[PDB]
């Protein structure tokens, strides 16, 4: 996160750490949506242009963290994966259309003061909150600066949702309905963005009708970090909701 701040303890108890078994190292972010289900971005797991092709067995999931490097004794939980699922129609070839994936944990995780899941939007919530100028929040343990160091604890930043055409006019990549872009314009004064290491993370919103936190997006792609005139792209969770409902229904929860 670029231009963010230090997250308070217990501020995003759904946040999750994709951790590389060996070399032991952080991979991406993700989030707790149930006691057995993690949600991330397909590109975190698979990206052939780079030989990125992970397995159930290649990685570790850590939940309840604040500190990036330290092994948080008696606070953090570590789990293992049972099965991995990617959207069948995920477009790794062109523009990351449908960058989304589901992960099922070996054993279900127990909730605590530092561990709790988020909600998934409904057509209405989604309709009502998913609007331009409305702010959402991003979290993660990724880089603090585009090129250079790294953060000590989870970082946070709130951004505004931008209008389709602006997004579109911001780049040469072919954009689909399963995306949205976020951030400040240049005439705005304020800055901030995600960066390397934030991917797969959660972009969220708080409902003003019932007070809950919903996951509207997954950190997908972008060009640079907090470059002026640039925005971050997010997978449109709602639009892919049916796929998720399925796999969850079909695979046990």
């Amino acid at each position: 996160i670029v231009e963010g701040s230090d997250a308070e303890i217990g501020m995003s108890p759904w946040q999750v750490m994709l951790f590389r078994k060996s070399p032991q190292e952080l991979l991406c972010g993700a989030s707790l949506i149930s006691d057995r289900w993690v949600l991330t971005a397909a590109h975190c797991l698979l990206y052939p242009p780079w030989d990125k092709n992970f397995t159930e067995n290649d990685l570790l999931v850590r939940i309840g963290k604040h500190s990036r490097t330290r092994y948080e004794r008696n606070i953090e939980k570590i789990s293992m994966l049972e099965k991995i699922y990617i959207h069948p129609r995920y477009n790794w070839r062109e523009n990351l259309d449908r960058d989304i994936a589901l992960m099922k944990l070996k054993k279900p995780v127990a909730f605590s003061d530092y561990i709790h899941p988020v909600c998934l939007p409904d057509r209405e919530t989604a309709a009502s909150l998913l609007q331009a100028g409305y702010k959402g929040r991003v979290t993660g343990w990724g880089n603090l600066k585009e090129t250079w160091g790294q953060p000590s604890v989870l970082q946070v930043v709130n951004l505004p949702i931008v209008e389709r055409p602006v997004c579109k006019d911001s780049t040469r990549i072919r954009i689909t309905d399963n995306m949205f872009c976020a951030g400040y314009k240049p005439d705005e004064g304020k800055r901030g963005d995600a960066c390397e290491g934030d991917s797969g993370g959660p972009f969220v919103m708080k409902s003003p009708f019932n007070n809950r936190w919903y996951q509207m997006g997954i950190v997908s792609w972008g060009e640079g970090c907090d470059r002026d005139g640039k925005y971050g792209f997010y997978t449109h969770v709602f639009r892919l909701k049916k796929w998720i409902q399925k796999v969850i229904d079909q695979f046990g929860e």
Binding site: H43, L60, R70, G222, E223
Partner: peptide, 14 residues
């Protein structure tokens, strides 16, 4: 894509 860790106790490494 935008175009030093403390050890973990093996007990977890399946």
């Amino acid at each position: 894509x935008r175009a030093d860790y403390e050890e973990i106790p093996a007990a977890y490494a399946x």
